[PDB]
Amino acid sequence: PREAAAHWVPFEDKANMPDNVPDVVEVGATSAPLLSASYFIGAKCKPYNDDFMLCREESQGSGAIDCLKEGRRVTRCAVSVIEDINKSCLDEFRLHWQCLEQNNHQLSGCRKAEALLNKCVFTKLNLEKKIPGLRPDEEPVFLKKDPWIKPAVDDFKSVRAYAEAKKNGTL
Template identity: 50%
Template sequence: MAESSAPVPVVANDPLPPLQELGATSAPLKSAAYFIGDQCKEFNEDFMLCKNENRDPAHCLAEGRKVTRCAADVLNKLRAACVQEFEAHWNCLEWNNQYYYACRKEERPLNACAFTKLGYKKEIPGSPEGKTPIHLIERPYFKRQQK
């Protein structure tokens, strides 16, 4: 008899099936952070609302799993569509103490790939209206310094 592939409803007292961790260090997560924030915004907001309701970690397991699955999906899509650009950017972050400003040159091709191939967008919260977003500035004032 074939197994059913229908999704199993989550019931409060049922144990949750195992979920693989993202399997990414801080550099790939930081490289994909804006895309994860854009694509997983609703799941993140639900999780944060749940955490504000109750500080018990078990209370929000289902919402946390949705956030993790969404982030894993974004990372997998970036790896599939933009592997070279993604690796170049997160390797730059890894070697430059996780500073975005030091990796703008590598960030531009990643953004272009994610925008065109995946339809992602990048909006930085709190950016002033009518000003060029920092990740689009061609000649930034702050640059890496030789020490």
């Protein structure tokens, strides 16, 4: 839809959901940690996400009311991913999304924290980052050694952590 125009007053609604709709926790993460956990959500919630979208498409208009079970599953899978991150991989995750905040949510300014986080989640949770649609001939941009595009200032904490991890063989 279009954005509002020329005047607009926000209005909330203090009503509760009907009782034939079970309750579901929300995700609760803001922009940056969710951008950091996007690929790990996609690695685990592919079937649930595409089932949600397929039941929306098959409904042909009534997707808001026909797809509630499916959306609840999607929300729960995402909450599980972020709970696993917080339980196990919180320091690297926080490095990554604070690094995203000081940039303009450009993942090109955060590769040194991204590497640590991807290693951590691949070892503990067994979820790896993959950019689909590519060929075996194409290099994914998050694995390039020397890119053209680099941050103005590389994040300090991430640099110190990358250095320490290379000195301790964690990478």
